[PDB]
Each structure stands twice: as C-alpha cells, then as structure tokens.
Amino acid sequence: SAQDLRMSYCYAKFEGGKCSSPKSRNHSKQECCCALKGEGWGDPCELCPTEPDEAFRQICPYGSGIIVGPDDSA
C-alpha cells in the first residue's frame, strides 16, 4: 500500500524543527498523516503534508480514512 511499507513512529505535533506525541507503536507514514493525521512521521519526524496538497493525498488516495487508526480511538 505505502512505500516500502515503512512503519515508524507517528508524531501528533511537529514544531517546525522537532516533534511530540509519538504513538508507542509505529504506522506507515501514510497511516500517520492520513488515518492518524498528526503533524510529523517517522523516528526522524518529517512534517506531514495537509489536504488537498498533492503530498497529502500522496499518502491518502481516498482521503483521511483508509485504515483509520484501528482500536486507536473511540
């Protein structure tokens, strides 16, 4: 589904320099800014894109959903 199905740490907040709120478990960079829609992704947090940015959809073909964080909310 994703690129090299890389599943690292997804951060919920990216301080245009660092990150915070990393999910104990790891998910695909797509599952991070798509289903988890955080602020950054990967151990080396990388600022995730936002819709409808070409990059945004680059991880979410259908949109913020795909595999909405299973048993990871509600």
Q: What is the CATH number of the domain that holds 57?
A: 3.90.290.10
How many Cα atoms within 13 Å fall on the side-chain side of residue 53? 10
| 13: amino acid identity, one letter | K
Q: Which residues have CB under 8 Å from 15's CB, separation 6+?
A: none
Cα(55)–Cα(49) distance, integer angstroms: 6
Count of the separate structural domains present in the chain: 1
Q: Residue 2 is part of which domain span? A: 1-74
Contact 53, 37 (CB under 8 A): no
Cα(58)–Cα(64) distance, integer angstroms: 11
